[PDB]
From a paper:
A monoclonal antibody with neutralizing activity against SARS-CoV-2 could potentially block the interaction between RBD/ACE2 to prevent virus entry and replication. We successfully generated human monoclonal antibodies (hmAbs) against the receptor binding domain (RBD) protein of SARS-CoV-2 using developed hybridoma technology.
Two Fab RBD complexes were produced, the 1D1 Fab formed a complex with the RBD (wild-type) and the 3D2 Fab formed a complex with the RBD (Beta variant) of SARS-CoV-2. To investigate the interactions between antibodies and the RBD protein, the crystals structures of the two Fab RBD complexes were determined. The 1D1 Fab RBD (wild-type) complex at 1.9 Å resolution and the 3D2 Fab RBD (Beta variant) complex at 2.2 Å. The result showed that the 1D1 Fab and 3D2 Fab bind to different epitopes on RBD proteins, i.e. 1D1 Fab and 3D2 Fab bind to class I&II and class III RBD binding epitopes, respectively. When defining the epitope of our antibodies with the epitope landscape of the RBD protein, it was found that 1D1 was grouped in RBD class 2 binding antibody. Interestingly, two of these isolated mAbs, 1D1 and 3D2 targeted non-competing epitopes on RBD. The results demonstrated that pairs of non-competing monoclonal antibodies could potentially be combined to form antibody cocktails (e.g., 3D2 and 1D1). In addition, the PRNT results also confirmed that this pair of the mAbs had high potency in the protection of SARS-CoV-2 Delta variant infection.
Numbering used by the authors:
A (entry chain H): 1 to 216
B (entry chain L): 1 to 213
C (entry chain A): 335 to 371, 373 to 517, 520 to 527
Write the structure that this text describes.
Amino acid sequence: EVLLVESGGGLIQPGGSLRLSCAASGFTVSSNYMIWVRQAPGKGLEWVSLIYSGGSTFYADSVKGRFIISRDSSKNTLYLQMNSLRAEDTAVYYCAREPYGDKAWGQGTLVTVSSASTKGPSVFPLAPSSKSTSGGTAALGCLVKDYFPEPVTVSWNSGALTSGVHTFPAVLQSSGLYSLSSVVTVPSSSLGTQTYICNVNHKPSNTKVDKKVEPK
Amino acid sequence: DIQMTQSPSSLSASVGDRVTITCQASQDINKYLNWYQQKPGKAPKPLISDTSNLQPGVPSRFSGSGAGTDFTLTISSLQPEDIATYYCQQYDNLPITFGQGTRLEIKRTVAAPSVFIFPPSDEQLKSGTASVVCLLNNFYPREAKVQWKVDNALQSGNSQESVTEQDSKDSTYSLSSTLTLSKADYEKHKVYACEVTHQGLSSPVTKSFNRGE
Amino acid sequence: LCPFGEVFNATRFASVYAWNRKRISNCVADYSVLYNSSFSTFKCYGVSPTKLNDLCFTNVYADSFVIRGDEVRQIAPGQTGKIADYNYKLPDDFTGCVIAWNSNNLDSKVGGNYNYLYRLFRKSNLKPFERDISTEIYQAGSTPCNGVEGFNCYFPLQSYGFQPTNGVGYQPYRVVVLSFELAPATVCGP
Ligand SMILES: *[C@@H]1O[C@H](CO)[C@@H](O)[C@H](O)[C@H]1NC(C)=O
C-alpha cells in the first residue's frame, strides 16, 4: 500500500525559508512523476510544482525563482524548498504521485506565513446545565481560546468518546488569535457516573491540556 | 493558462438524485481532464482520470464524459457519503489548473436544533473576559439565526459563530455562537439569552441563564 | 539533386520515440526550393536557409517523426518536456533547421489514430540524437515487473490517438530536422 507523509510545515516569518518533505512508501520517488499542490484556508486547489520521472522540473509562475522541487532516492523522499515566503503562500501543501502512474495523495502539511508569535490556548469548561432534562440529553464542552497559529486537536476521554462530538472550525478574533469550542451530547443520567475530559493539543506552542468538565 | 470554470459552485440534491457537475476549459484539453473529491477535513482523492476512467475504490455511480472544452461529472444515485467539494483538473498543459470547486450538500427532512447555553467559567472571568456560548446541535437545513439578548437588549457586533460541515452520519449541521464581553460589562447585567430561529421550530426557542445562579 | 522528397513526401512517418534518420551524401541540395515550398515552422540554428546554398557539409541528416502541435516548440535547443527529455533531443549547440507542418488531413482518424506513440516513462533524459526503442515494462517501484503490466509496472509508450476534430494543439504535425556536420565535403548548394 502506498503512503505519502508530508512534514516540515509550521509558522514562518515573511521572507523566511522552509523545506517540506514527503516520505513515500510503496513506490520509488526518483522513478515517478510527482507534484506539490496547495490549498489556502477555505480556498481551492493550486498546482505549485512538478518533477518528471527523469528529473525535469516545472513551477507555477507565482513560486518561480522562490521554490525548488527535488528528491533524495536514498531516503525515498520528495522535497519542496520554499524561499522568500509571503503571506499568500499560507496553505496546506500536499504531495502526490501525479499526473502519471498509480495516483496517490498525502494528508498535507500546514505552512503559516505571519510575523505574529506562537501562543498556546487557554482551555475553559462549558459545564453541563443544572436543568439538564432528567431522562434526556445534556451538552458539555471545552472552549479553546486565544491561540496562534492553527491547528489544535481536541479528543474526549483520550479518544474513548467520539459519538455526539462536534469540534467547531476556529474563528479568528479581532485580536488575531483563534478560538474554537468542542462539545459533546451525552445522556443526562451519565453526568453522575461518567468523567468527561477534553484533551487539547497545540503542537506549535507544545501545549497539551486535559480539562475535566463537570456540573458546577 | 487554461482557466477551468465548474458549474454550479454549490448544489443541494436528494438521496437517489442524478447529479451533474460541468467543467469548461478556456481552450481544448482533448481528453486530459481529471476529477477530485475532497471530503470535509480530508485531502483530495482522485475520482476520475482522462475524462471517464474510474480510480481505485470509487463506486460506478460516479462517471465522467465530455471532450475538448466541455466535461461532465455525473453521480447517478446520490448517497450521503458523497458530501464533498469536487474539483476538475487539466494536467496536460502547464500550468496544471483546477476548477474553483463544487460544494455538494445532501437533503434530508427538516430537523430542529437542540439548543444549549453556557455561562463563562469562573476561571475565565477572574482573568478579565466573559465568553458566553450558544450551541445549536444537529439541525437541517443549514439556515439558522442566533440572536443574543442581554437583559433583553439585542446584541450586535460582539459575537462570532462557526458551523460544522454537513455530517454524512445524519446529514445535519451544528453551530457555535460565542458572545464576548469584558468582566466589568458581564457583571453589569443579569439575563443572558440566545434566541434561535430555524424552519424546524414553530416559533423561536430561547435558552437563558441569570448571572450568579 | 539530394532525395529530400523521399523524406518530406513519405506516405508514413515514424513515431517520435522511433524517429527515422536519412543520411544524405554525395549530392546537391536546393534548400531555398524547401524554404518556400508549405511549412508552419522553418527555424534554422547557426545557419540561414539562404546561406545553405553556398555551403558544403561532410553529411546531412534528415530526422523525421510526428508529434502534436503544442510539442513542436520542444524540437529546439535547450527545451525540456516529455518530447525533448524522452523522445527526440537536440543539442544546445545545434546547427540545422527544424521544419514542421500540420498533418491532420494525413495522420488523424475518426475514433483515433493509435499508431503514433511517444515515450511517457523514462528514468533519465536522452542525450542529443539518442533514439530509445525499448518496449520494456517500466519498473516504478522496487518490485521487478517480469514483463507484466500492473501496479508500479507501466507500458512505457502512450498513443496520441489523433482525431480530425482535435484542436490544433492536439493535431498531428510532421517534423523534419536537418543536421549539417563538418573528411571530404559531399553535400553542396548549386
Ligand atoms: C513533394 O510533393 C509535391 C507534390 O507532388 C512536390 O511538388 C514537392 O516538390 C515535394 N517536396 C519535396 C521537398 O521534394
